[PDB]
Every structure is written in C-alpha cells, then in structure tokens.
Design an enzyme around this catalytic site. Sequence first.
Site, short mmCIF file in Angstrom:
data_model
loop_
_atom_site.label_atom_id
_atom_site.label_comp_id
_atom_site.label_asym_id
_atom_site.label_seq_id
_atom_site.Cartn_x
_atom_site.Cartn_y
_atom_site.Cartn_z
CB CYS A 1 -0.98 0.14 1.15
SG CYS A 1 -1.93 1.64 1.33
NE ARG B 1 2.58 0.41 3.59
CZ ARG B 1 3.74 -0.26 3.70
NH1 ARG B 1 4.16 -1.02 4.74
NH2 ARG B 1 4.52 -0.42 2.51
CD1 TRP C 1 -6.85 9.78 -1.53
CD2 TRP C 1 -7.63 9.87 0.77
NE1 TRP C 1 -5.67 10.23 -0.46
CE2 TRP C 1 -6.40 10.27 0.73
CE3 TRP C 1 -8.37 9.97 1.83
CZ2 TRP C 1 -5.77 10.69 2.04
CZ3 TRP C 1 -7.86 10.40 2.84
CH2 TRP C 1 -6.56 10.87 3.09
CD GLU D 1 -5.84 3.03 -6.12
OE1 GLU D 1 -6.31 1.75 -5.84
OE2 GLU D 1 -5.79 3.98 -5.58
C1 HEM Z 1 -6.29 6.86 1.97
C2 HEM Z 1 -5.55 6.55 0.58
C3 HEM Z 1 -5.03 5.40 0.26
C4 HEM Z 1 -4.70 5.21 -0.99
C5 HEM Z 1 -4.07 6.50 -2.00
C6 HEM Z 1 -4.14 3.89 -1.27
C7 HEM Z 1 -3.58 3.38 -2.54
C8 HEM Z 1 -3.31 2.10 -2.70
C9 HEM Z 1 -2.82 1.32 -3.88
C10 HEM Z 1 -2.80 2.35 -5.24
C11 HEM Z 1 -2.76 0.10 -3.70
C12 HEM Z 1 -2.37 -0.67 -5.04
C13 HEM Z 1 -3.90 -1.42 -5.56
C14 HEM Z 1 -3.89 -2.02 -6.60
O1 HEM Z 1 -3.08 -1.43 -7.60
O2 HEM Z 1 -4.82 -2.73 -7.12
C15 HEM Z 1 -3.16 -0.18 -2.40
C16 HEM Z 1 -3.03 -1.47 -1.99
C17 HEM Z 1 -3.56 -1.81 -0.65
N1 HEM Z 1 -4.20 -1.02 0.28
FE1 HEM Z 1 -4.10 1.35 0.21
N2 HEM Z 1 -4.73 3.17 -0.26
C18 HEM Z 1 -5.34 3.90 0.77
C19 HEM Z 1 -5.87 3.66 1.76
C20 HEM Z 1 -5.88 2.32 2.37
C21 HEM Z 1 -6.70 2.09 3.72
C22 HEM Z 1 -7.41 2.97 4.40
C23 HEM Z 1 -6.55 0.82 3.88
C24 HEM Z 1 -6.86 -0.15 4.91
C25 HEM Z 1 -7.39 0.35 6.16
C26 HEM Z 1 -5.64 0.19 2.89
C27 HEM Z 1 -5.16 -1.12 2.65
C28 HEM Z 1 -4.58 -1.51 1.56
C29 HEM Z 1 -4.13 -2.91 1.30
C30 HEM Z 1 -4.39 -4.02 2.39
C31 HEM Z 1 -3.46 -3.05 -0.27
C32 HEM Z 1 -2.98 -4.36 -0.68
C33 HEM Z 1 -4.10 -5.02 -1.35
C34 HEM Z 1 -3.33 -6.43 -1.73
O3 HEM Z 1 -2.57 -7.05 -1.17
O4 HEM Z 1 -3.75 -7.05 -2.94
N3 HEM Z 1 -5.36 1.28 2.06
N4 HEM Z 1 -3.44 1.08 -1.74
C1 LIG Z 2 -8.21 -7.62 -8.21
N1 LIG Z 2 -6.86 -6.59 -8.05
C2 LIG Z 2 -6.02 -7.06 -7.00
C3 LIG Z 2 -6.72 -6.88 -5.68
C4 LIG Z 2 -7.10 -7.94 -4.78
C5 LIG Z 2 -7.85 -7.47 -3.51
C6 LIG Z 2 -8.25 -8.49 -2.82
N2 LIG Z 2 -8.84 -9.38 -2.50
C7 LIG Z 2 -7.70 -6.20 -3.05
C8 LIG Z 2 -7.13 -5.23 -3.90
O1 LIG Z 2 -7.12 -3.88 -3.19
C9 LIG Z 2 -5.96 -3.13 -3.41
C10 LIG Z 2 -6.56 -1.81 -2.86
C11 LIG Z 2 -7.14 -2.13 -1.10
C12 LIG Z 2 -7.47 -0.82 -0.82
C13 LIG Z 2 -7.38 0.47 -1.15
C14 LIG Z 2 -8.09 1.44 -0.72
C15 LIG Z 2 -8.44 1.44 0.72
C16 LIG Z 2 -7.87 2.88 -1.22
C17 LIG Z 2 -7.30 2.96 -2.56
N3 LIG Z 2 -7.29 3.86 -3.29
N4 LIG Z 2 -6.78 1.65 -2.97
C18 LIG Z 2 -6.75 0.45 -2.36
C19 LIG Z 2 -6.49 -0.54 -3.26
C20 LIG Z 2 -6.76 -5.27 -4.92
#
Ligand code: HEM
Ligand SMILES: CNCc1cc(C#N)cc(OCc2ccc3c(C)cc(N)nc3c2)c1
Lengths: 407, 411
Positions: free
Chosen positions: B108, B111, B280, B285
């Site tokens: 992420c 963070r 957000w 994305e």
């Molecule tokens: C607030 C602004 C946030 C931004 C800009 C952000 C951005 C991102 C982005 C761009 C990814 C890659 C997602 C993808 O390409 O599919 C990601 C992954 C992830 N985000 Fe963040 N996120 C935010 C908030 C959060 C919050 C609030 C949580 C949980 C409380 C969170 C948990 C995660 C997790 C667990 C992943 C990994 C998903 C996986 O392992 O497949 N995010 N985030």
């Molecule tokens: C199928 N794509 C892979 C994929 C699988 C799963 C699962 N299982 C979850 C995924 O979440 C990434 C993610 C999670 C949270 C986010 C939040 C809170 C905000 C944000 N802007 N982007 C986020 C992106 C992505």
Amino acid sequence: RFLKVKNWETDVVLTDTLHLKSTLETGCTEHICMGSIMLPTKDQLFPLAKEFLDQYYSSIKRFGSKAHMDRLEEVNKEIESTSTYQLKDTELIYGAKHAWRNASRCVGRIQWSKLQVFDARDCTTAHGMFNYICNHVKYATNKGNLRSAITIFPQRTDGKHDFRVWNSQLIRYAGYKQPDGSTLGDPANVQFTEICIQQGWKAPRGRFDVLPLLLQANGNDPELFQIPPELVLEVPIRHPKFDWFKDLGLKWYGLPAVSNMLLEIGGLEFSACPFSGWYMGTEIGVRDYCDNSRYNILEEVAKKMDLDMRKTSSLWKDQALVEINIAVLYSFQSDKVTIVDHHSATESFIKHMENEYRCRGGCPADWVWIVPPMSGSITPVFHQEMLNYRLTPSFEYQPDPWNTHVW
Amino acid sequence: RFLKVKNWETDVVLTDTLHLKSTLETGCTEHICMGSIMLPVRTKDQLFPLAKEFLDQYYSSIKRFGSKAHMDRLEEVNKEIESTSTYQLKDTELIYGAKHAWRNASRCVGRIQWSKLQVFDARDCTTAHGMFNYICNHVKYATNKGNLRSAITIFPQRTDGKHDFRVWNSQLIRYAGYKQPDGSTLGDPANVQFTEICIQQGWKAPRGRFDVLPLLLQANGNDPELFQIPPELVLEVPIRHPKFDWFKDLGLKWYGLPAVSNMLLEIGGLEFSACPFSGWYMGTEIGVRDYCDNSRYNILEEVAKKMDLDMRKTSSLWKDQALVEINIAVLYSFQSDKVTIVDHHSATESFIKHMENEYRCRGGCPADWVWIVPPMSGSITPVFHQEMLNYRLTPSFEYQPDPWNTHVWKG
Ligand code: HEM
Ligand SMILES: CNCc1cc(C#N)cc(OCc2ccc3c(C)cc(N)nc3c2)c1
Ligand code: HEM
Ligand SMILES: CNCc1cc(C#N)cc(OCc2ccc3c(C)cc(N)nc3c2)c1
Ligand SMILES: C[C@H](O)[C@H](O)[C@H]1CNc2nc(N)[nH]c(=O)c2N1
Ligand SMILES: C[C@H](O)[C@H](O)[C@H]1CNc2nc(N)[nH]c(=O)c2N1
Ligand SMILES: [Zn+2]
C-alpha cells in the site's frame, strides 16, 4: 515443488520445473524478500565443470556418450594438474549463449541463440583488446543493422592477471562537473570521466563526448584508446511532430554494449567479456534522458511544450516523457538503426517465455526489471507472474576495477 | 542481523531491524523468488502465542509493557481462550489492530495516513440488514460529500468457520458487467461473474454501462442477501478532459469512494472475515487500470481514435499517449468536483517520506516494490529507484477465498 505462474490478463498458466536445476542463491529467505535489491580452488571447480558438461552433452543429445565421459575425464585430469581448464570453442559458444538465456533481468532474450561469439582468449595486451573491441563494435553495428555479439577475453587465473574493460559500456558520453554546480554531458559517468582525464585523456568538454576505452590486460595498468569515430554510429534526435525538438541538440549512440560484467562458465571466470545487442527505446528516453541523476531534460522539454508545470497533477512530466520516447524511436527508425519499442519487446518476451516453459520447462525472470520503466500496466509482462532464480552459465556483477587494481 | 536498503537516485541508505519481528512467510526461498506472484477453524493450541504476541505489541506501544495492566490482560485472555477457545479484543485493541494491519500493508503506497483511520466497531451486528445499515453509515461517513475520510467497519470475528460474516462484493461500490451473446461486454468486464451471481440472487439489472452493483451480504454463515445502496450515498464524478471537449461524450464516469471489502483482517490470532475499508483513489487506479487494462473498460483505442493518433504501429506510442490523457482527465474531473484524489507523483513522494520516517521510528517499513511502483511512468517517480524489503508483520490484511466457492447453501 512444481510451481505455476499465472498471467492474470489471459489466465494462461505455465508450470515451472527448471527452477529445481538452480544452484546459486537469490538473496531472499522464507521471512524476507529482496526482489528489489540492485545487487545480490580445485575442489570447488570440478563439480562446476561436470554440471556444465553434463548440460552441454544433453543439449546435443549425446548424454552418457563415450564422447561425454571422455570429455569429462579429460577436463578432470586437466584440472587436477593445471588447477584450471580450458573450454572447447563449442562449449565456449554454448556457454555464452546460455549466460544470456539465463539472464533473468533481460527482456531481450528471445534472440538468445543468435549471438555472435568472438573468441579473444589468445589476447595479451591492451592494444590487442582495443583491436578486438574495435572489430566487435564494427561487426555489431553493421551500418545500423545491429547484430548481437560478445567478445571473450582470457579467463581469470589467480585474480592478479585479470583482463578488465574499465568502461561500464564500450560507448558512453562524458560527464563533467561545473564550478557552477550542475553537470555537463552525462551525469552517470562523472566519476569515470574524471578517471579518464585523471589518466591522461584530453576532454573535448561537450555534452556528447564519446569516452575513450580504458583497457586492462593481464592485470597490468590500464590504457586509454580512442575508438574511431567512424565506428561510433549516432542518431540525431528529432520529433515527427514538433520541429522545435531538433533544436534541443540531442543525439544518442546506436550500440548498447555492456562491458563491466563477469561471464561464468563451468566454474571459469571471464572478467572481460563486452557484450552488445540493440536498444529498447525506453533505455535511452525514459532512463538516459529523464532520470533525475541523468540528463533530466524533462523540465526543458515540458517548457517548450508550454505545459503547466505548476502542479504535479497536470501530469506534465508524463506527457513530456512520452513525446521524448516517441522521438527516440522515430529518430532511430528514420535512420535505419535497429531499435525496439517497449510494447514490441515485452510482447516478444511473453512469446519467448511460452517457448521456454514449453521446450525447457521454465524461464528465470525478474519482474522488477522486465517491466518497462513507463506505461507498465499496458504492456503484457505487467500481468505476468514470473519466477526469479539463478541458473548457470551466467553474467554476474563484479567490483569496479579501480577499487581493486594494485597499480 | 541488520539489513540495508539504498535509494539509488539519492544514495540515501536505511537500516532495517524490524524484519526480525517477522513471523509469517514470504513464499520466497534461498533458491527462488516469488516476488511477483499475486498470492503466494484455528485452534487454542496455536492461538495463545498469537494473542500474547499481539498484546505484547499493544502494551509496548502504549508504554505499559510488563505493567500490572499488561499481565492481568494476558491472564484474562488466557483464561478466556482455554474456556471458550477464542477471545474478545477490547475496543482499544481493535482500533490499534486495524491501524497496524494497514500500517503493515506492504503493498500500500498510501500508508502515510495509517494513523488517521476511523474504526467502526460492528461486532454487535447479527443480520444482513444490520450489515447493510453499518455499511451505509460507513459510506456516508467516508464520503463526507467528497472530502474523503479513511474508515474501516469491522464485523464479528470468525468462530468455527461455519458462521462467517462476509461481504461478497469485492468493493462496496462497483459497476456491473454483462457478457453479451455476441461475446462483447457491457459495463465493467472485471465484475461480470459477480454481476451474474447477483442477478441469479434476484437482482434486477438495469443493464447499463455504469450500474452500481447491489450489496450481497452474509451474516453469521447464513445465505447472503441483496441490498441497494441508496443512490444519494453513491458519489460519482463524470469524466471530462481539460482541453479535449469530445472526452465528455465518451460518456464515462467513476465513483469517488474506493472501499475494499473481500479481505480478511487478522489481529492477535482472531480472524475478521468481513472488514470493509476505504480511503481515496490514486489517479492511476482508475485511469490506468480501470479504463485502459485490456481486461477492463479498454477505451484506449477510442481515446486514441478521437485524438487521431497513428494507431498502425505500436512504436508511435499512441497507447502511451492516450493513457496519459485519460489520467489527466481523471484527475481533472475529481479535482473540479472537489472529490479527494491523489496523483501518482504526489503519492509516491509521500510514501518515500513515510518510509524514511518509519525506518527511523519503527526500525523498518515492509514494502512490495512490485505493487508500490505506479502502473505508468514508474521511473520518474521516486519509489522506482528505491530498494525495498518485503516481509509480513501482524496484524495484517490477508486474501481469502471467494465466498461463493466455499459457502454452504442453506436455502
Ligand atoms: C487513503 C488513501 C489510500 C491510497 C491512495 C491507497 C493506495 C493504494 C494503492 C494504489 C494500492 C495498489 C492497489 C492496486 O493496484 O490494486 C493499495 C493497496 C492496498 N491498500 Fe492502500 N490506499 C489508501 C488507503 C488504504 C486503507 C485505508 C487501507 C486499509 C485500512 C488500505 C489497505 C491496502 C491494502 C491491504 C492493499 C494491498 C491489497 C493487496 O494485497 O492485494 N489502503 N493502496
Ligand atoms: C483484483 N485487484 C487486486 C486486488 C485484490 C484484492 C483482494 N482481495 C484487493 C485489492 O485492493 C487493493 C486496494 C485496497 C484498498 C485500497 C484503498 C482502501 C484505497 C485505494 N485508493 N486503493 C486501494 C487498493 C486489489
Ligand atoms: C538484442 C537486444 C537486447 C535488448 C532489447 C535487451 C534489453 C534489455 C533491457 C531493457 C534490460 C534492462 C536494463 C536496464 O534497464 O538497465 C536488459 C538487461 C540485461 N541484458 Fe539484455 N537486451 C538485449 C541483448 C542482450 C545481450 C546480447 C546480452 C548478453 C549476451 C544481454 C544481457 C543482459 C543482462 C545480463 C541484463 C541485466 C544485467 C543486470 O543484472 O543488471 N542482453 N536487457
Ligand atoms: C546501472 N543499471 C544497472 C546495471 C548494472 C550493470 C552492471 N554491472 C549492467 C547493466 O546492464 C543492463 C543491460 C545490459 C546489457 C544490455 C544489452 C546487451 C542491450 C540492451 N539494449 N540493454 C542492456 C542493458 C545494468
Ligand atoms: C531500486 C530498484 O530496484 C532499482 O533502481 C531497479 C528497479 N528496476 C529496474 N529495472 C530496470 N530495467 N533497470 C533498472 O536499472 C532498474 N532499477
Ligand atoms: C503478476 C503481477 O505480480 C501482478 O499483475 C501485479 C503486478 N503489480 C501490481 N501492482 C499494483 N499496484 N496493482 C496490481 O494489480 C498489480 N498486479
Ligand atoms: Zn523474493
């Protein structure tokens, strides 16, 4: 222990078995992954020779043959006596092709079996090395119709007689510091550019000064040599749409030829082994022009485009990065110099992967390096899982000579 | 054992000790790296060490390690486990746990914000309707009329694995996908299978290109139920371009609130199978993945055509050119409507600062380079040249299998 890799765009699944033939270590453990880290005697040697010879005689469908066992015994006896051994030409060519084949970070490997190997193991002097390198450059260049090649200098003996090409690439532009504070020429090469001047080089002090060669033979002090300009093919960079682009006064060299790596074959160590192919567009335009620690001309370009460089949110860097890269490809293509774009190379690589899973049982691949440095997710390698492991023969990193060489 | 990472653009080097606290496994070995692999009913036997470790963490963070409060709590959880074979987190523990699961999310990039998370405790919830209600309030709170606020809503923990709470949607807000007889797809291709489940469950599909899907909610292991989020709660942004007037006519729009709902939250051995979280959007994305990926809306060609690009050979980089314009439009549209969005430059810069601060105050920051680097223009963002160590800390967010594959149907 038979691993699957999935392409998430096509659901195509390949099974990997080749990795079980891997010997060297990755740097990772069960508790930590290091996939984004840049850098990682007689008894030792014979198993290494045997492993290599065993794969060699298998690849020629003569595994277990009298020829096989005879060669094995021959090398064994040569080792126990001479504490090393020599490769047959056939094995030398096989090894080099397979070091490229096994280069997990290289997106270009679909071409791997079409490599021209130049045997320079009879070389004894810097002047000699210069001759061999000049011939390499001229052959590889082929008037724009680039051909892959490697030139192999004598193997290491005792670490005191190493052959080394001190340049990182055979052809690279000088980089000089200004008292003004910034950097003229090419910033990546500032220390080497200093070393050359520090070694007697007369610097033309321009942006695009071809660096001299700094060759080390038999472990002696290195020598400066000026590559004949007529052997250095260069492309002027212009844009197919923006006529002002020509005015920026940019060019690049057609031949990418990495010269600082070590080629390992059957335990033997080739510390000098310059190798070359042809550029992917982004290697010059994304990295060599727009990296902060490089030409960093992005700002300048965006200005001429009259883009709003006030907020990052306008994506002006992105827009400019693209035009620059459109120009590189246009310029090379117009001049009939070989170049491949990142869409084509990655498409090729996916095809090559399929071939290697099919005929070899796998293909070591380093996603962090295979994915192009721009437009990553609209290229097919992005959604392609890859397994990274170290096969041999291989190309390895080695220390910079000036940190080691006793003068 | 100390480990160093190097930023090759700035030569800045940081030292990781935090990796020593790592329990779970990477998937990697000394002879193979699975760095690019997308994904590489618990008993009292192995639950109390998991609890103790969490409580040790928790009480360290509040500077009460080894206090009477710390020991009693250990004792209380201990007796509660051996008596009930599970245990309950205090509210303080739940909030700490949820924040650190995010903090520990190595993939992420956002963070820097982890400490500003709004935790909604929905552990008293018992029905699908109760889930609908909690989720509605989450959406309303998080959306905040466009000024987005991070939040997570946490439903009751797994017990015997036969009474799971699950949100069957992959995100709370997402568009339908319809496979047509002719093989073409109407709407978001990514959601076709789920859309079909919904329809089967009795959903009446409006069958448009941007239908918000209904919530499919499972409480206490019962069959899931269909609810429609009230449209006034679903904030959407029509996509237009600042220079290209024809861009609006592509008829595109996207929703404002990214809220992921199919992951599992692990805290001190406890498993929270329904835990939707939202923050957000990073621009890419939507702009790179949600529109331009070939298995998504895939408007690249149309945008390219309207730009009159040379689409004959790829080496014109028409694909690259269209992609940039599309992301420009996405950011343009959101900012114009005062809906929170961050561009990939701002966010990666922020992350690098976050990371550095984490190495100094925490001793490391686990990070997955493969996922942290943005999907366009990678090397002109500062994370590209940044070395990163990846390892798994708890609390964490984990993948879990799709509920429709495991669910035992009641009727
Ligand atoms: C607030 C602004 C946030 C931004 C800009 C952000 C951005 C991102 C982005 C761009 C990814 C890659 C997602 C993808 O390409 O599919 C990601 C992954 C992830 N985000 Fe963040 N996120 C935010 C908030 C959060 C919050 C609030 C949580 C949980 C409380 C969170 C948990 C995660 C997790 C667990 C992943 C990994 C998903 C996986 O392992 O497949 N995010 N985030
Ligand atoms: C199928 N794509 C892979 C994929 C699988 C799963 C699962 N299982 C979850 C995924 O979440 C990434 C993610 C999670 C949270 C986010 C939040 C809170 C905000 C944000 N802007 N982007 C986020 C992106 C992505
Ligand atoms: C013929 C066309 C070729 C293309 C288009 C190509 C492409 C590339 C690219 C884009 C990289 C990434 C490097 C970077 O971004 O800094 C790379 C790395 C590499 N290439 Fe190829 N290559 C070609 C030929 C060759 C040949 C002929 C060899 C050796 C015989 C070779 C060996 C390697 C090795 C060893 C690396 C990684 C070095 C490291 O570990 O840092 N390549 N290649
Ligand atoms: C500084 N970046 C890390 C780096 C370190 C070293 C070392 N030691 C070598 C590196 O070579 C990448 C490379 C090697 C060969 C190439 C060939 C033949 C063709 C081509 N088009 N591109 C190539 C790129 C890169
Ligand atoms: C820090 C990062 O791992 C390092 O700079 C790598 C990342 N990926 C790369 N990929 C390619 N092709 N070339 C590179 O130099 C790098 N640099
Ligand atoms: C195979 C590969 O690991 C997979 O496609 C990953 C690569 N990196 C990614 N990075 C981000 N941010 N999001 C993704 O969905 C993916 N997909
Ligand atoms: Zn790894």
